[PDB]
UniProtKB/Swiss-Prot annotation, chains B, F:
Palmitoylated. Depalmitoylated upon L-glutamate stimulation. Ubiquitinated by RNF167, leading to its degradation. The lineage of its organism: Eukaryota, Metazoa, Chordata, Craniata, Vertebrata. It is found in: Cell membrane; Postsynaptic cell membrane; Postsynaptic density membrane. Induction: Down-regulated in the pyramidal cell layer of CA1 in the hippocampus by global ischemia. This is Glutamate receptor 2. It comes from Rattus norvegicus (Rat).
């Protein structure tokens, strides 16, 4: 009995709405790659130039050296469209280093590929200028959740 | 006419044209030479279709 | 999506409906499409030979049509080619004293600008603002060759 | 006197060279470059008038458009556009009056 | 151009495989790597010949 | 006798020039017109100084 | 707001450039300048810092 709904179907639709042709897809092998297989299977059917990068196996004492070196390879093709298919805790780690190098101004556009968009801290990139999309399954606007949050 | 390209562009009696799509027509298009730009502005507005 | 005020619901995804957007702006930030008026008078503004199959602003061609883009290029607005339909340019009535033609559609707020062979006169300068002359002219003579021989 | 401008041009063409018509130079120069190429502008202009771009008073487009017209006249765009729609697009080409 | 060719059924195998190479024809792909076991390779090889 | 401005550039028997500095000389400089650009290329390399 | 990328240039007009936190705008790309009165490379200050 899987309480988590299928997100891969929703992510494939959001990439179509924004009309993306080539983008970066960051993923971690720990959470898996079922959604990575979904965007790769449709990469041929819908003509996408996905630059998939495995950000999973990285040490914690080399975060500043590997993350800054990661966006150096994301600059060879002038990547400006990135999908973050990671956990909430790992998104904030990527978000923080994006702000340090300054890749969050008017021009970039990120997609947080998890069902918890408002769960992580994101006021950090709220005023940078880059558009940030995501998905929310816990709609805090519903009255049932409001009685729960109180 | 005297055998020459400019003597063909000076007079408009004996009309002249190229293929509707090809490397020949695109030559006169972006040509920044005075003799050839005169030939392009003619064929571009030559009626009927040359 | 992430906007200035914070997280903002744009649409909901479902397996049966895919992405259904429920928009927030409408708008938004439209500004305005600058309304431009002119007279169908050769060679300044002429309907193209295939004006039926075409549509928009390309259905007309002429001197002022080429002048329309060159003015919008150094200013940055989006023009909407409109015909006065009268179609002569005012010239006002004696006792009615209502402006007609292209000059009338400027005073009465119908159009935002008017580009055409409009004679710069004093009676028109009192109600609208005239630009510098883009084409000097004057009264001239017209005859045949003839000869015929003769 | 004629009713419309179209009748004035049609009257000169049927007079065998015994009737003239007075009109603005821009409209006169355009009829000269259209078939059957039977009209001709002779002599200079009689007055110094000009065409302009009209904007409502106090409009935001007022001053910028006026400054934009002078930029096109000095960059040769206005003279180029006039040459492109009076002589390039003309049927009686500017090279038709030269050499038969 | 990575395709998860594993999750395919054996009854729609003729329709899915022919649908797979129609997607590979969008890029005019002439260089393919078959990273399947020797069983599924022969199933891909046979459909390549068809 | 008194031909036009275009034919003035077609012959070099009767030379022609403008002022050494003024709005007249700058007109032919950036003139993207084929007839006037031919007049500018002549006066720019006309010897003696026109 | 993101006004620290390649293009901006700031000048901190006080005698304590290194006294504040600078590593945050260190990797943004914008050039930052300032003034320092406590020279940590002098032996007198090094004996004081030790």
């Amino acid at each position: 009995i899987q309480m988590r709904p299928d997100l891969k179907g929703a992510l494939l639709s959001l990439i179509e709405y924004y009309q993306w042709d080539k983008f970066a897809y960051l993923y971690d092998s720990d959470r898996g790659l079922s959604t990575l297989q979904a965007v790769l299977d449709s990469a041929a059917e819908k003509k996408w130039q996905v630059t998939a990068i495995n950000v999973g196996n990285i040490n914690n004492d080399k975060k500043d050296e590997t993350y800054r070196s990661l966006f150096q390879d994301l600059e060879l093709k002038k990547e400006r469209r990135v999908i973050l298919d990671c956990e909430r805790d790992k998104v904030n780690d990527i978000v923080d280093q994006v702000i340090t190098i300054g890749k969050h101004v008017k021009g970039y556009h990120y997609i947080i590929a998890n069902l918890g968009f408002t769960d992580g801290d994101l006021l950090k990139i709220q005023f940078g200028g880059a558009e940030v999309s995501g998905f929310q399954i816990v709609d805090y606007d519903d009255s049932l959740v409001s009685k729960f949050i109180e | 006419p005297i055998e020459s390209a400019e003597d063909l562009s000076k007079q408009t009696e004996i009309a002249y044209g190229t293929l509707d799509s090809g490397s020949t027509k695109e030559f006169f298009r972006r040509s920044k030479i005075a003799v050839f730009d005169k030939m392009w502005t003619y064929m571009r507005s030559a009626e009927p279709s040359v | 999506e992430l906007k200035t005020n914070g997280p903002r619901k744009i649409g909901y995804w479902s397996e049966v409906d895919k992405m259904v957007l429920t928009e927030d702006d409408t708008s938004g930030l439209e500004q305005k499409t600058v309304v431009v008026t002119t007279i169908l008078e050769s060679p300044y503004v002429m309907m193209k030979k295939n004006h039926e199959m075409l549509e928009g602003n390309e259905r007309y061609e002429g001197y002022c049509v080429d002048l329309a883009a060159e003015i919008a290029k150094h200013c940055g607005f989006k023009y909407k080619l409109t015909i006065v339909g009268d179609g002569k340019y005012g010239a006002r009535d004696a006792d009615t004293k209502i402006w007609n033609g292209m000059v009338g559609e400027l005073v009465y707020g119908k159009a935002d600008i008017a580009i055409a062979p409009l004679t710069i006169t004093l009676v028109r300068e009192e109600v609208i603002d005239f630009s510098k002359p883009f084409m000097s002219l004057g009264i001239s003579i017209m005859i045949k060759k003839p000869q015929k021989s003769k | 006197f004629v009713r419309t401008t179209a009748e004035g041009v049609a009257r000169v063409r049927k007079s065998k060279g015994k009737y003239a018509y007075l009109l603005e130079s821009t409209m006169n120069e355009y009829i000269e470059q259209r078939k059957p190429c039977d009209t001709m502008k002779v002599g200079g202009n009689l007055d110094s008038k000009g065409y302009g771009i009209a904007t409502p008073k106090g409009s935001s487009l007022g001053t910028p458009v006026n400054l934009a017209v002078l930029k096109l006249s000095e960059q040769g765009v206005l003279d180029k556009l006039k040459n492109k729609w009076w002589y390039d697009k003309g049927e009686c080409g500017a090279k038709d009056s030269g050499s038969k």
